[PDB]
């Protein structure tokens, strides 16, 4: 079987586009990320999602953003999608002002926290480094 | 009744522990590929088919170039973590 897609709408697609980071963090500017956000928004919109693009979000905004998104009424939504575009390291993503564990972000949609999305697919696309290892290739 | 951790799907641009490539010109590899595959097959295939294809594209049509040997000709493979309990089609 497949997920039921007979709802008024497919759902909400939140895009977090972090390009510039505070001097402190030492993290560089992510050139090429505005092209990504443009492509993704254009693409998820045609699939049928209600796309919202946020830029250079602090760690506070990102948590708040997602918390309040999970508090909405998704009763008439088929699914939910969230695309993260930023710097990262093992199990964490960067805000403009610091670091946030990914688990805390996705937690807002777990069980009782969002009874409205239960049994519905929650998709997280994450474009962010997960360490500094490099795949050299083969053959 | 059901698990609180069910029905989630994480499509990571890279594997645990690795760097994730991007071009200041055309954007990151994972996103460029994710989009082209979605444009074509978005209304036909199932995300797993979609994402599996994405895995193939960034793994064969991408290799880095750098004036530094430390970062020259490197490769990348995305990572799909799934807890979905059913097939997902964006259509009817």
């Amino acid at each position: 079987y497949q997920y039921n897609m007979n709802f008024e709408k497919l759902g909400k697609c939140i895009i977090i586009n972090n390009k510039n980071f505070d001097k402190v963090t030492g993290m560089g500017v992510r050139n090429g990320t505005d092209k990504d956000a443009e492509a993704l928004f254009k693409c998820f919109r045609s699939l049928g999602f209600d796309v919202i693009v946020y830029n250079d979000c602090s760690c506070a905004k990102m948590q708040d953003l997602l918390k309040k998104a999970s508090e909405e009424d998704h009763t008439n939504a088929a699914c939910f999608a969230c695309i993260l575009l930023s710097h990262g390291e093992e199990n964490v993503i960067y805000g403009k002002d610091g670091v946030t564990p990914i688990k805390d972000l996705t937690a807002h949609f777990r069980g009782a926290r969002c009874k409205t999305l239960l049994e519905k697919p929650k998709l997280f696309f994450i474009q962010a480094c997960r360490g500094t290892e490099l795949d050299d290739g083969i053959q | 009744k059901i698990p609180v951790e069910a029905d989630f799907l994480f499509a990571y641009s890279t594997v645990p522990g690795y760097y994730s490539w991007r071009s200041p010109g055309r954007g990151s590899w994972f996103v460029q590929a994710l989009c082209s595959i979605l444009e074509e097959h978005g209304k036909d295939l199932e995300i797993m088919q979609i994402l599996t294809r994405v895995n193939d594209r960034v793994a064969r049509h991408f290799e880095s170039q750098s004036d530094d040997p430390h970062f020259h000709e490197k490769k990348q493979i995305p990572c799909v973590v799934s807890m979905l309990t059913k097939e997902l089609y964006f259509s009817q």
């Binding site: - | 991007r22 010109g25 290799e63 530094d68 970062f71």
Partner: peptide
């Protein structure tokens, strides 16, 4: 190292542009 620095700060980009 310069290699490790450029990587942790995500400054290493792909130059396949040109």
């Amino acid at each position: 190292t310069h290699a490790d620095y450029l990587l942790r700060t995500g400054q290493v980009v792909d130059i396949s542009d040109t």
